């Protein structure tokens, strides 16, 4: 990590991380110190919410590049100004940095008999994510350990699909460990892609479809 | 030893007796013995 940047880590968000990064940090650090908490309070405030859907932000680092301050600060730099200003700036930055949506994914632990494997493979394909991280023969028993991953939005009913398609044989557990949000396929901000109502979204964009339905709920 | 007596209520067998009986009855009785096969075929699910 850059030695200045590492020394300039201000704090983490309600999540990611804030760094100070400009010549004015050297020019007026005392002045700037007076405004840290106002910034600090705001950032948790701003990152806890979001510019697309009022949802929290992941995997993002911010660096203060410039900060102009009112001549003779006659109690001018008030929290009423800077907190929202800072919030706005964050939002703009995210947008111009090319935003994306992230989707949570489960770890799919499936236990089956060997000849029921092909079934399982097809199920994964059908659901959407269709990802199996590993297959391990369970030494000592007529069983396989199947580890996969599955998009939570495509998880509804998944377990019963398994149970029914395998005729009662084998079983599934979904556990959230690692808490990793994978990039949602489509570009975060393109108008064109979506197709009419009641149709599962085409693969190219699941990011654009995701925002609008959430956008409407927000207002 | 085998029976209640004359009346014929109540019965009990030896192991080999049971095993012969079981083996002979196999063609007529075949089921997926595990509770698991009837995931959505039990009474409760029908009621629902």
Curated annotation (Swiss-Prot), chain A:
Q: Can you say where in the cell this protein is located?
A: Nucleus
The species this protein was found in: Saccharomyces cerevisiae (strain ATCC 204508 / S288c)
Q: Which residues cross the membrane?
A: none
Give the gene that encodes this protein: SNU114
Give the similarity note: Belongs to the TRAFAC class translation factor GTPase superfamily. Classic translation factor GTPase family. EF-G/EF-2 subfamily.
UniProt name for this protein: Pre-mRNA-splicing factor SNU114
What is the recorded function of this protein according to its Swiss-Prot or TrEMBL entry? Component of the U5 snRNP complex required for pre-mRNA splicing. Binds GTP.
| Additional comment | Present with 300 molecules/cell in log phase SD medium.
UniProt subunit comment:
Belongs to the CWC complex (or CEF1-associated complex), a spliceosome sub-complex reminiscent of a late-stage spliceosome composed of the U2, U5 and U6 snRNAs and at least BUD13, BUD31, BRR2, CDC40, CEF1, CLF1, CUS1, CWC2, CWC15, CWC21, CWC22, CWC23, CWC24, CWC25, CWC27, ECM2, HSH155, IST3, ISY1, LEA1, MSL1, NTC20, PRP8, PRP9, PRP11, PRP19, PRP21, PRP22, PRP45, PRP46, SLU7, SMB1, SMD1, SMD2, SMD3, SMX2, SMX3, SNT309, SNU114, SPP2, SYF1, SYF2, RSE1 and YJU2.
Swiss-Prot record, chain B:
Per its UniProt entry, which superkingdom is the organism in?
Eukaryota
Q: Where is this gene product found? A: Nucleus
The disulfide bonds in this chain are none
User: What is this protein's function per UniProt?
Assistant: Functions as a scaffold that mediates the ordered assembly of spliceosomal proteins and snRNAs. Required for association of BRR2 with the spliceosomal U5 snRNP, and the subsequent assembly of the U4/U6-U5 tri-snRNP complex. Functions as a scaffold that positions spliceosomal U2, U5 and U6 snRNAs at splice sites on pre-mRNA substrates, so that splicing can occur. Interacts with both the 5' and the 3' splice site, as well as the branch region. Has a role in branch site-3' splice site selection. Associates with the branch site-3' splice 3'-exon region. Also has a role in cell cycle.
What's written under domain? The MPN (JAB/Mov34) domain has structural similarity with deubiquitinating enzymes, but lacks the residues that would bind the catalytic metal ion.
What further note is attached to this protein's record? Present with 468 molecules/cell in log phase SD medium.
Q: How does it assemble?
A: Component of the U4/U6-U5 tri-snRNP complex composed of the U4, U6 and U5 snRNAs and at least PRP3, PRP4, PRP6, PRP8, PRP18, PRP31, PRP38, SNU13, SNU23, SNU66, SNU114, SPP381, SMB1, SMD1, SMD2, SMD3, SMX2, SMX3, LSM2, LSM3, LSM4, LSM5, LSM6, LSM7, LSM8, BRR2 and DIB1.
- State the protein's name: Pre-mRNA-splicing factor 8
Part of the whole protein covered: 291 to 338 of 2413
